[PDB]
């Protein structure tokens, strides 16, 4: 059906590439949050799932629009599933 936004590889790429669309990068996005790029990826992929990681994941979603994040994330998943079938 439709999926809600979950962490993982696609979450991380959609956020990473969104920063590119609006012309920042991971490095410069991370700094005002007092966090590392490496910590940003771990939270985004769901590898770190502590509640501090959730707070950061929510900032990534609010950076994109929540609706825009869902649309990018959803259409991307559709394309992978299409190659897997």
Residue numbers in the entry: 4 to 88
Task: Please share excerpts from the published article on this structure.
Anti‐CRISPR (Acr) proteins, which are naturally occurring inhibitors of CRISPR‐Cas systems, have evolved as a counterdefense mechanism employed by bacteriophages and other mobile genetic elements. The AcrVIA6 protein, which targets the type VI‐A CRISPR‐Cas system, has been identified as a potent Cas13a inhibitor. While an initial study suggested that AcrIVA6 is a true anti‐CRISPR protein, another study argued that AcrIVA6 might not be an anti‐CRISPR due to its inability to inhibit Cas13 activity in an in vivo system. However, there is currently conflicting debate regarding the anti‐CRISPR function of AcrVIA6. This study reveals that AcrVIA6 functions as a DNA‐binding protein rather than a Cas13a inhibitor, as it does not block RNA cleavage.
